[PDB]
């Protein structure tokens, strides 16, 4: 009836992070980022407590047994999870929770009662995704290949009926960001009432 959380997914290197950062900055009073937990090493320019909760695998696994995570899955040999407190933190600020998860996270979230909107940020082609991943250069050659492999599997699943409410083709960043705003108009209107 009113505002609902937002689940944004897609293949690695498809522009999900950049689209969210512009959305969060331009709409700080509407959207709050869900800070997931990860076991991978921090990228340059990454800050703990904002992009992720950078923890070791022992710390992450101790939290899984403690039940701190609404969802969790492994990706590229590193652990990821959405903590229950991460969603509650955004809810405590009267903001729409925006989550960045993989395909496994989306299916896990389909079980939960958050009832979010599902947005898939897709590249124009698989080859373009490789170039954008290679330009970022934050992954090893082996990690890039398996990230490419998971991209195509998530690419085909993006066409699953009823999985993604809205699919964004990330060809032009301005065009993709405009489409993101348009699909979020109902959420922004609901939050502002
Ligand atoms: N519209 C676009 N055109 C060209 N490159 C883009 C576009 N959007 C994003 N990128 C590339 O994607 C990279 C960042 O991707 P990122 O959002 O971190 O991937 P993920 O979706 O896994 O978070 C940047 O290096 C940027 O060059
Ligand atoms: N299941 C799940 N996946 C996540 C979570 N956070 C990030 N991911 C996904 O894991 C991958 C990690 O990408 P990175 O953040 O290392 O660039 C991305 O596909 C991202 O969407 C999470 O909390 N849970
Ligand atoms: F969210 Al990414 F590579 F930046 F999976
Ligand atoms: K996240
Ligand atoms: Mg990201």
Swiss-Prot record:
Main localization category: other
Cited InterPro entries: GK/Ca_channel_bsu, Guanylate_kin-like_dom, Guanylate_kinase, Guanylate_kinase_CS, P-loop_NTPase
Catalytic-site annotation from UniProt: 43, 136, 147
Expression across tissues: Widely expressed.
Domain Guanylate kinase-like: 3-185
Listed SMART domains: GuKc (SM00072)
Residues annotated for substrate binding in this entry: 36-50
UniProt: ATP binding residues: 13-18, 136, 170-171
Effect of residue 1 to L: Increases in kcat with GMP as substrate
Sites bearing N-acetylserine, chain numbering: 1
Endpoints of the signal sequence: none
GO cellular component, as recorded: cytosol; mitochondrion; photoreceptor inner segment
UniProt GO MF annotations: ATP binding; guanylate kinase activity
Catalytic activity, reaction form: GMP + ATP = GDP + ADP
Keywords of this entry: Acetylation, ATP-binding, Cytoplasm, Disease variant, Kinase, Mitochondrion, Nucleotide-binding, Transferase
EC number: 2.7.4.8
Listed Pfam families: Guanylate_kin
NCBIfam families reported for this sequence: guanyl_kin
Role: Catalyzes the phosphorylation of GMP to GDP. Essential enzyme for recycling GMP and indirectly, cyclic GMP (cGMP). Involved in the cGMP metabolism in photoreceptors. It may also have a role in the survival and growth progression of some tumors. In addition to its physiological role, GUK1 is essential for converting prodrugs used for the treatment of cancers and viral infections into their pharmacologically active metabolites, most notably acyclovir, ganciclovir, and 6-thioguanine and its closely related analog 6-mercaptopurine.
Family: Belongs to the guanylate kinase family.
Quaternary structure and interacting proteins, as annotated: Monomer. Interacts with RD3.
Protein's name according to its UniProt entry: Guanylate kinase
Organism: Homo sapiens
Gene for this chain: GUK1
């Amino acid at each position: 009836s009113g505002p609902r959380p937002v689940v944004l997914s897609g293949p690695s290197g498809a522009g999900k992070s950049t689209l969210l950062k512009r959305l969060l900055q331009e709409h700080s009073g509407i959207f709050g980022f869900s800070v997931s937990h990860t076991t991978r090493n921090p990228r340059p320019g990454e800050e703990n407590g904002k992009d992720y909760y950078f923890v070791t695998r022992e710390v992450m696994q101790r939290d899984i047994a403690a039940g701190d995570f609404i969802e969790h899955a492994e990706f590229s040999g590193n652990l990821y999870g959405t903590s229950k407190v991460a969603v509650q933190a955004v809810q405590a600020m009267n903001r729409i929770c925006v989550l960045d998860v993989d395909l496994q996270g989306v299916r896990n979230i389909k079980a939960t009662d958050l009832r979010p909107i599902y947005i898939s940020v897709q590249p124009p082609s698989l080859h373009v995704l490789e170039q954008r991943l290679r330009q970022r250069n934050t992954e090893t050659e082996e990690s890039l290949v398996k990230r490419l492999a998971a991209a195509q599997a998530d690419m085909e699943s993006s066409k699953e009926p009823g999985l993604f409410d809205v699919v964004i083709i990330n060809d032009s960043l301005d065009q993709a960001y405009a489409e993101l705003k348009e699909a979020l108009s109902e959420e922004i209107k609901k939050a502002q009432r």
